[PDB]
Paper text:
Briefly, as implied from its name, the CU system transports its protein cargo, known as pilus subunits, across periplasm and outer membrane in a relay manner mediated by two functionally conserved proteins known as a periplasmic chaperone and an outer membrane usher. In this study, we report the crystal structure of P. aeruginosa CupB2. Similar to other CU chaperones, the CupB2 structure reveals a classical boomerang-like fold consisting of two immunoglobulin (Ig)-like domains. With the structural and biochemical data presented here, it is now clear that CupB2 is an FGS-type chaperone with two functionally different Ig domains.
Author numbering: 31 to 124, 134 to 165, 174 to 216, 223 to 247
The structure:
Amino acid sequence: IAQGTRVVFPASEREVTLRVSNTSGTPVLAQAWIDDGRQDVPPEELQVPFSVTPAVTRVEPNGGAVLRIAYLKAPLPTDRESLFWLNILEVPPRFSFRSRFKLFFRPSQLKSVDSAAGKLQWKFLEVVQVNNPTPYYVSFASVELIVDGRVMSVGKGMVAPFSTKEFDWMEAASVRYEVINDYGGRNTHDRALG
């Protein structure tokens, strides 16, 4: 269901499409909606500047539907990505299953996402910290401390533009981390700890 692991929404566009596949042998209804990180309130009341058409869709057995995401020109930061969430709920019966994808609104002048993961700087607090001095979210599939080949896994996550993230778990450590690109692929980086 969806391929698709994230949506990049470039400021120059009025809309972007997305495929959702029904891999099973029965029709399912797919409901789609966007929120701004709050999942605990009726979506309409958040007035996020995105709509998803159609909001509810039948998806054929071994088939796929196309969802359409449209931006309503609204004041969002101009110097950094904004983060929204696409939800897809399968009401497939009938119980039902719910998916949640990152949506990155990306201002036009931001052309260097591919360089971002490599400008992160790292340091110990005990407990380690990454500083993201860039305009882009950086999503980690894995972060690891390494000492003479010994791997100590500290978790995955995401660091927001112009922010710091802390990872918790000595010594001559290096950090190795993998990040998810715009297309769901992964790239890796090693760095020393400050």
